[PDB]
Amino acid sequence: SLKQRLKGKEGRVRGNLMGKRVDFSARTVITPDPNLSIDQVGVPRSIA
Amino acid sequence: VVSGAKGSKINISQVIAVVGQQNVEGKRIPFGFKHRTLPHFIKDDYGPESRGFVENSYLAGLTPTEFFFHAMGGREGLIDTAVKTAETGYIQRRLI
């Protein structure tokens, strides 16, 4: 229903308005590196 | 341990000397069978080895009754870790 479309954690308020899917974002595994500063992240080329 | 990077004195004591008393819900290994903990023990046996005290260390290895009592304590720890998560996240959500 409409109330079931809005009421859930997967609904419109929480599921789409509060927390929504975003463009310009990447997700991959992290592996350590001690040869770069604390504010540097070493991203891949195919992400960049 | 002395640097405090990883581990504590308890891990040294359990690897070298003795694992120690295994617990389920803050007390000893309960009588799941009729008045005994495992069917290898005589009934009404309140001794150390019958009730879950492990006298071996991880260097020597555990006897099978001590292995099973150790697995009970570990299952209690994993149950705590798996049940904690949702309730703590919901407390965080309500607070924010």
């Binding site: 001690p34 | 070298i16 000397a17 309140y46 001794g47 150390p48 006298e55 991880y58 260097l59």
Partner: protein
């Protein structure tokens, strides 16, 4: 950076040599387990 590059010269490990005490210590451990186990048994015969 500089403590990792000293650690290449130093080196740090962990082993099974780091988990074994000398036999006097093992005798102390087994004497203490035997004493406490006999003490629990005599507490039990007091309790009965």
């Amino acid at each position: 950076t500089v403590i990792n590059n000293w650690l290449l010269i130093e080196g740090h490990t962990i082993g099974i040599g780091d988990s074994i005490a000398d036999s006097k210590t093992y005798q102390d451990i087994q004497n203490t387990i035997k004493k406490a186990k006999q003490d629990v048994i005599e507490v039990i015969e007091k309790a009965h």
